[PDB]
Swiss-Prot record, chain D:
Cysteines engaged in disulfide bonds, as pairs: none
Gene for this chain: FAS1
First-to-last residue of the parent protein present: 514 to 706 of 2051
Superkingdom to which the source organism belongs: Eukaryota
Function: Fatty acid synthetase catalyzes the formation of long-chain fatty acids from acetyl-CoA, malonyl-CoA and NADPH. The beta subunit contains domains for: [acyl-carrier-protein] acetyltransferase and malonyltransferase, S-acyl fatty acid synthase thioesterase, enoyl-[acyl-carrier-protein] reductase, and 3-hydroxypalmitoyl-[acyl-carrier-protein] dehydratase.
Protein name according to UniProt: Fatty acid synthase subunit beta
Taxonomic source organism: Saccharomyces cerevisiae (strain ATCC 204508 / S288c) (Baker's yeast)
Family (UniProt): Belongs to the fungal fatty acid synthetase subunit beta family.
Subunit record text: [Alpha(6)beta(6)] hexamers of two multifunctional subunits (alpha and beta).
Length: 317, 192, 64, 193
């Protein structure tokens, strides 16, 4: 039933065995994809260019994914699910995309930016191919903690670890959109409410708190100076932490609480204490969201009220 | 449609035409359009978020067009209005509409008075007489509002523990505005 | 020093604190009737806005 | 096309059936019209008798007007005392004639500086009724008058003067010179001779 098809860039091939009622639509995609590929150059060493066969498959893998919906049935659902299995079976030795990215960094042609690409592609692809991340994974850590030769403690960070904190929220939203989109949107909305709900909160958010907007159009994102002042930076940092918890939980095949169970305990530094408390109150996904609400609605008030208490004033130049 | 208005033999560009010039957000509602003498076109624009009447165009007794020019942001929330009056006259096909000039400055002054001055409308001052203002206590919050309005983040104006709040020299204008502006109002200083 | 300044998005904020409810600055139909380029920023705002710059950079933020 | 130029003004519209080309004038039509679906395929040439038929029409005060393209714009009888030097120089006569409800052109020929004509234009205005208007006749072959005049006219309109048309005698300005008058001066219409 199998009928060869090559995914091509520069001196990099990946031969792709294709089913019968398929090689039609498959070739169509192959062609369209070939068009978008930037011209090869000096070991494909540009920024758009795939470094390796693996990266290329991820590329095409992501291109096909761009043309599908989970809600309605598509005509590429056939091809996508097939390139998935061949990428998985061929390039992932069963481990996580993350393990591959590391290999591709260490051994092959190092690009953090390209690594992130590859990861965006695989997770994104898989989730839009109606093919979720529910089956406990063989995390050697979590396996060994589970047995008894290891124990976990969740530590949560505070304010002031980074100049560009909001950046971490971007990379999260942008990369793992298929996993975190919910609570980003959920938070963006629930924070919006806190501001109506609250008396003079509006005055503190001089340039508004449209988190969803700033994410979509970087162009519209306010200064680091605005983003860093607590009333908006406290809640946002927490969302970042919650968001990270979730990619770890979801990607392990665990519920929020299932993840929490592997923990000997948790603790935060400064404002990170809040999420640790709220994280341990966590059980099932349906219930996960009130836990989020609690956390960020605390942070919001810490931020808004502590700013009001002692607000930054001009430094004598 | 008449491109020009009249003011004492002088020809101005048509103000009605001007004020109704299109633009996203404005909405015109003509009511009773088919009978001439009763027609009332009404312009409503977005004012502080919600829509509201800004202009009201109709006829009055004895062939007098009236353009009710409405300001919604006032001292007490109760909208104020400037009555602009125009003589319509079908015997001059070329310049039918001319403006009623007698007392035009006075009407404009009266509306500005209601917006600036918390006193009775009396335009009978001697320009040479001293104008007394009002006493004025500087609230801690009038300062917060002003500094934040102009964007002055000086620590001398921000409430800090164990320091009295200072007011910006700029704040002088907030205090004297009513005493000062009154000075351009008397009848002997007739201005538009 | 050479400093970068900006006029406000709307004029209502300055009008409220100052008591200058002049429609020229707030209502487009009045601005347009007077034949202005738009809803002109309060000349007084620029006065206090620029002054703030002088205050900060020339007086080292010593209001006094 | 031969028959077309025979008929021109009579509402007949010739179409050349055998050539798909383009007429810069729309004088007539080519192969396309015979087949077009849009209202673009139904063109008709003008009948001057009908198109430009004089008419009558009534004021509300019930005055009667000879309605033509001209009077339809100006709102008075389609008759005018053209600028004339000795005759139309006098602010008195341009007032009187304009007060009698007729369009008259104030003669530039008799004025020699912005200041001297400003004198008359202001006299004319003093005698003319409220909301009334007149015009100014300037000579092309006199570059001096044309130099203090065009400005005086523009400076005057800007102040809102009731002088709402310019006529130019002795020659027709060039496209850039004319365009200047049209857009620069605040005039209701321009008169060419």
């Amino acid at each position: 039933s199998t009928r060869p098809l090559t995914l091509s860039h520069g001196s990099l091939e990946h031969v792709l065995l294709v089913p019968t009622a398929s090689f039609f639509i498959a070739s169509q995609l192959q062609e369209q994809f070939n068009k978008i590929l930037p011209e090869p150059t000096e070991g494909f060493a540009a920024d758009d260019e795939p470094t390796t066969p693996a990266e290329l498959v991820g590329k095409f893998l992501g291109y096909v994914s761009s043309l599908v919906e989970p809600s309605k049935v598509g005509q590429f659902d056939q091809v996508l699910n097939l390139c998935l299995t061949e990428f998985e079976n061929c390039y992932l030795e069963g481990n996580d995309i993350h393990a591959l990215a590391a290999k591709l960094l260490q051994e092959n042609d190092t690009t953090l930016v390209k690594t992130k690409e590859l990861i965006k592609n695989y997770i994104t692809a898989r989730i839009m191919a109606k093919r979720p991340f529910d089956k406990k994974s063989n995390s050697a850590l979590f396996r060994a903690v589970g047995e008894g030769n290891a124990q976990l403690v969740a530590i949560f960070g505070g304010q002031g670890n980074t100049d560009d904190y909001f950046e971490e929220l971007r990379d999260l939203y942008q990369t793992y959109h298929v996993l975190v989109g919910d609570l980003i949107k959920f938070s963006a909305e629930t924070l919006s409410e806190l501001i109506r709900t609250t008396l003079d909160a509006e005055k503190v958010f001089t340039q508004g708190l449209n988190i969803l907007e700033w994410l979509e159009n970087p162009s519209n994102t306010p200064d680091k100076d605005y983003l860093l002042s607590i009333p908006i930076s406290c809640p946002l940092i927490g969302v970042i932490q919650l968001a990270h918890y979730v990619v770890t939980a979801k990607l392990l095949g665990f519920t929020p609480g299932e993840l929490r169970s592997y923990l000997k305990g948790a603790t935060g530094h400064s404002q990170g204490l809040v999420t640790a408390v709220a994280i341990a109150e966590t059980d099932s996904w349906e219930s996960f969201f009130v836990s989020v609400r609690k956390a960020i609605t605390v942070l919001f008030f810490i931020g808004v009220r502590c700013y009001e208490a002692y607000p930054n004033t001009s430094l004598p130049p | 449609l008449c491109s020009f208005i009249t003011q004492d033999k002088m020809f101005v560009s048509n103000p009605i035409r001007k004020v109704f010039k299109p633009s996203q957000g404005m909405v015109v509602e003509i009511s009773n359009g088919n009978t001439s003498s009763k027609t009332v076109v009404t312009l409503s624009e977005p004012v502080q978020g919600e829509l509201k009447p800004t202009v009201i165009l109709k006829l009055l007794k004895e062939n007098i067009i009236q353009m009710e020019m409405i300001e919604n942001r006032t001292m007490d929330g109760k909208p104020v209005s400037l009555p602009l009056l125009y003589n319509f006259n079908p015997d001059n096909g070329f310049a039918p509409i001319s403006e009623v000039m007698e007392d035009r400055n006075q009407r404009i002054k009266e509306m500005y008075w209601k917006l600036w001055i918390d006193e009775p409308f009396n335009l009978d001052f001697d320009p040479r007489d001293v104008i007394k203002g009002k006493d004025f206590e500087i609230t801690a919050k009038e300062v917060y509002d002003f500094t934040h309005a102009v964007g002055n983040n000086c620590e001398d104006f921000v409430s800090r523990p164990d320091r009295t709040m200072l007011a910006p020299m700029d704040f002088a204008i907030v205090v004297g505005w009513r005493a000062i502006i009154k000075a351009i109002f008397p009848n002997t200083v007739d201005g538009d | 020093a050479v400093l970068d300044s900006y006029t406000p998005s709307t004029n209502e904020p300055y009008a409220r604190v100052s008591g200058d409810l002049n429609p020229i600055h707030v209502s487009r139909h009045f601005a347009s009737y007077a034949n202005l380029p738009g809803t002109i920023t309060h000349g007084m705002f620029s006065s206090a806005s620029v002054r703030a710059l002088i205050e900060n950079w020339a007086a080292d933020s010593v209001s006094s | 096309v031969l028959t077309h130029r025979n008929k021109d003004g009579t509402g007949v519209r010739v179409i050349v059936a055998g050539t798909l080309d383009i007429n810069p004038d729309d004088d007539y039509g080519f192969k396309q019209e015979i087949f077009d679906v849009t209202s673009n395929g139904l063109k008709k040439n003008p009948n001057w008798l009908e198109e430009y038929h004089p008419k009558l029409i009534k004021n509300k005060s019930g005055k009667i007007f000879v309605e033509t393209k001209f009077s339809k714009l100006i709102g008075r009888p389609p008759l005018l005392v053209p600028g004339m030097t000795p005759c139309t120089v006098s602010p008195d006569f341009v007032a009187a004639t304009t007060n009698a409800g007729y369009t008259i052109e104030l003669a530039g020929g008799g004025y020699f500086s912005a200041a001297g004509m400003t004198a008359a234009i202001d006299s004319v205005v003093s005698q003319i009724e409220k909301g009334s208007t007149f015009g100014i006749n300037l000579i092309y072959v006199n570059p001096f008058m044309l130099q203090w005049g065009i400005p005086l006219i523009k400076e005057l309109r800007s102040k809102g003067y009731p002088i709402q048309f310019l006529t130019i005698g002795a020659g027709v300005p060039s496209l850039e010179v004319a365009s200047e008058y049209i857009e620069t001066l605040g005039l209701k219409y321009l008169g060419l001779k």
